[PDB]
Structures are given as C-alpha cells and as structure tokens.
C-alpha cells in the first residue's frame, strides 16, 4: 500500500490545500461529507465504515484561515485535531515563526504527523505547501522541515513552495524571510518545486482569458499540478512513475533540487471547441517559456533533467515522437553532460475539472517538472533585493528582538551565494 502525507504551512498552504482537497474529492468521487456513494488510499484513509478522512495537517498560527475550513463546506471531511491553530500569527517575521511563537506549536505538529505515519503502512513521502515570503510559511516551515529531517530520515519531502515574484509582491520583508528560508529548504527538502504568483497571473490572464485573476483561480490550477504529480500513485498507466522515482532522475546533484513546473493544455471552455489537443501539440506548449509556473525564461539556461506526466488518451508512441522533436529544437537546450534528459510518465485517467471552475474538460494533459540552470536568476534577483535592504539595516530590529542574532542574515546570504555560483559552475560546459 502506498500513501503520502500532505502538510500545509501558513496562509498560502491552506488556500492551496483548500483547492487541492476540493479536487482530490472529485477525482475519487467523495462527497464533502466524507462518504463515497482502492484508488483513494494515497490521500484518504478508510476509517471505520464509509468515512474517508484526508491525510493532511493544516497548521497555521493565524486562526482566520483555519476556522474558514472549520466552518465551510469541507468541515465534516477533516479530523478536528488535524487542523492545527495558534493564538497569534508570526506577522511576517522569520524569527517569530522559528524561535518565539513557533516552538509551542512545532511539538504538537509532529504528534499529528507521527499518528498519521503510524496509520499508513507504506509511507512514500511528504508534500509540503508553504510560502517563503511570509512569517508562518517560511519560519514555521523551516522548523517543521528541520524536525522532519531528524525524526524521519531518508523519507521523501517535496517542496511545493510559493516564491516572491520579481515585480509583483505584497509585503516589504519578503526578501528577508525568503533568504532565511533558503538556508533551511536546501539541507532538508529533497525535491523542491518553485511556484511564482505572477507567472500564474500570466497564465490566468492569457491561457484562460480571465481578465481579473485571484488566488482562488490561481490555486485551482496549482492543485492540478500536484494532482497530476500523484496520478500514477492512484491510477494505472503504461509507464508508472513513483514519488521516489522523481528523485532518482530530476536531481543530478544533492544541492541542485529546484524544479520548474508547467501544465500544458490550460484551455478555457470556449477555446476548447476549436483547438485540437494532440500529444505533440501540448508537449510543445509545455516547454513554452510563457507556460512556466515560475517567472523565468528557461531559454537563458540549459536543462539538466526533465520529467513529463501524461494523463488520458496518450499512447506511448506519440510521446516518443514528441520528445524527439522537442529535443532537436534549437530554441531549447540541454546540458552536455546529460545526453538523455527525459523521464516519461503516462496515466490513464483524464484530468478532472472542478465544478464552476475555469479549465475546460480535456482528454490529454502534460505536467512537466524540470530542473534547469535558469533557476539561478531566481536567487540572484533575491540576493540583490536582500543586499539592497541589509546594507542600510532595514527592518532588522524586528528580527533581532525576536530571537535572532544580527549575523544570521550573513550566514543565509553567504549560503545563497554558494547556491548562486554552483548553478553556473554545473551549467558551464566542459
């Protein structure tokens, strides 16, 4: 038996997790009450008779995002002790999320993880949803990932983290909390998938023709990527791919574990009537720089390793023809020490559309999770924003008086500085 535990940290994680478990109930036919009128084992635990409870913990220090789940349409689904709340929020402070108000809740979080790990027979990994821009997402996410590394060795932890965009952001101390979070997600997270809000807003405005995108329309397609990642855990396929198998192909080196994500057939309902969605056609659109889920231009760097997740009516022949044409394309480029680059996965289940949603009903889909050397300019831009703020010592007095020392910023930037140079060193030809 195969199971995963999906942990969600902070305001971003719960609202993603609200959209994730909304779509997971539709895939397995579970009503929001928790009763279905063996594919459900990886996410839901068959409890007693006729009750399905998700395998998740919803921890946040601010009550306001958690009691919305406790009151809304999915209140009967979640076990009451699974949703963890606190009295006061971290308030955009990494030190508060790590030292002062994060220590009285990290102990109770591991207790729920231990009882969830005891329930599942074959635990396959961990899915962490957080935002490094905030205090609870970055700070308490750092403490939980640190404790899960010591407590659960060798187990997979998958970082689906939300990252500050270049031009669009909604907080002032996002450079501080994100650099401090990068000192933690290196040594603990096994494979980390970057997510950027503004790239989804580029997708939502253009691909879906939604002139006013919001976080709800943002999260519905982010929930599709993580659902497409776990598709072979729940349904059969021609080429099954497992959670521990992505790690054997997508991270060439232990310190290079940042992944760019992409979803191919993101077409609205009215556009879907005319467009013919062939396997080769969506594979071409999966590698488009506009269709990336992070604000990067992957033409800048070279691809180290790529993995593809095909769902629906996909014969294993047209995937092999599609990867041949995308390999020969000049505007894309692979690094010279990885001659083969692709991992192909096929799942027989067509993608499921949420009711009242935005994505159209399609027969095929691609989810590309790729490692590239264009992720170096993510960290270089944040290093410029951190150094421009840390030079004149801005907002430091909030972090210093809440547990930290002054030099912790110097350790985190120097750690990120090594993360800047090794992307260029690996991506350089020999």
């Amino acid at each position: 038996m195969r199971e995963v535990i999906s942990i969600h940290i902070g305001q971003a994680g719960i609202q993603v997790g609200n959209a994730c478990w909304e779509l997971y109930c539709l895939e397995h036919g579970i009503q929001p009450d928790g009763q279905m009128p063996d594919a459900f084992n990886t996410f839901f635990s068959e409890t007693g008779a006729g009750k399905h409870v998700p395998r998740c913990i919803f921890l946040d220090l601010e009550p306001t995002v958690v009691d919305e789940v406790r009151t809304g349409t999915y209140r009967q689904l979640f076990h009451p002790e699974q949703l963890i709340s606190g009295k006061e929020d971290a308030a955009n402070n990494f030190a508060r999320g790590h030292y002062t108000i994060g220590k009285e809740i990290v102990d109770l979080a591991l207790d729920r993880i231990r009882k969830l790990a005891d329930n599942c027979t074959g635990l396959q990994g961990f899915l962490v949803f957080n935002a490094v821009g905030g205090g609870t997402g970055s700070g308490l996410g750092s403490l939980l990932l640190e404790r899960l590394s010591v407590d659960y060795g060798k187990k997979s932890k998958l970082g689906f983290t939300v990252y500050p965009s270049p031009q669009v952001s909604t907080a002032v101390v996002e450079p501080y909390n994100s650099v401090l979070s990068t000192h933690s997600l290196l040594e603990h997270t096994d494979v980390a998938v970057m997510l950027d809000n503004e790239a989804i807003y580029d997708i939502c405005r253009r691909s879906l023709d939604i002139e006013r995108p919001t976080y709800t329309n943002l999260n519905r397609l982010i929930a599709q990527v993580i659902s497409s990642l776990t598709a072979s855990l729940r349904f059969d396929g021609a080429l099954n791919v497992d959670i521990t198998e992505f790690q054997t192909n997508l991270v060439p080196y232990p310190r290079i574990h940042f992944m760019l994500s992409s979803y191919a057939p993101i077409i609205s309902a009215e556009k879907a009537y005319h467009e013919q969605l062939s396997v080769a056609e969506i594979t071409n659109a999966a590698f488009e720089p506009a269709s990336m889920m992070v604000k990067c231009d992957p033409r800048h760097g070279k691809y180290m390793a790529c993995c593809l997740m095909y769902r629906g009516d996909v014969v294993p022949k047209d995937v092999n023809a599609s990867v041949a044409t995308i390999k020969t394309k000049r505007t894309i480029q692979f690094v010279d020490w990885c001659p083969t680059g692709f991992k192909c996965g096929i799942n027989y289940q067509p993608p499921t559309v949420v009711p009242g949603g935005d994505l159209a009903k399609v027969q095929r889909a691609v989810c590309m999770i790729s490692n590239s050397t264009a992720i170096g300019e993510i960290f270089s831009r944040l290093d410029h924003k951190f150094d421009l703020m840390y030079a004149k010592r801005a907002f430091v007095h909030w972090y210093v008086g809440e547990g930290m020392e002054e030099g912790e910023f110097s350790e985190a930037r120097e750690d990120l500085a090594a993360l800047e140079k090794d992307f260029e060193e690996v991506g350089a030809e020999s």
Partner: protein, 50 residues
C-alpha cells in the same frame, strides 16, 4: 445622513445580504459567461443586419 454611506441608489451600495457573500471566482466566472453570451448575441444581430 451618513457621509461614507451611499444613498440607496448609487453603484457603491450593497444590501446586507450582498455584502456578506464571498465567492469572487464564482461571480467572475458567472460574469465572464454572461459577457460571452451577450457578445455572441451582439455578433448575431450584426450578422443579421449585414
């Protein structure tokens, strides 16, 4: 009267039922579908006129 409160006939006003509804994505989806249907009607009328 009340300064910041509108006067029951303005675009700014909400009912007490309306001000507590929270479905932003749902309302924008409904507006998008209605706008597309209205655009189809306008195109049909222009086609008939031509």
């Amino acid at each position: 009267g009340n300064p910041v409160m509108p006067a029951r006939n303005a675009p700014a006003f909400c009912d007490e039922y309306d001000r507590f509804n929270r479905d932003v994505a749902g309302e924008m989806n409904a507006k998008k579908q209605q706008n597309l249907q209205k655009k189809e009607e306008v195109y049909a009328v222009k086609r008939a006129e031509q």
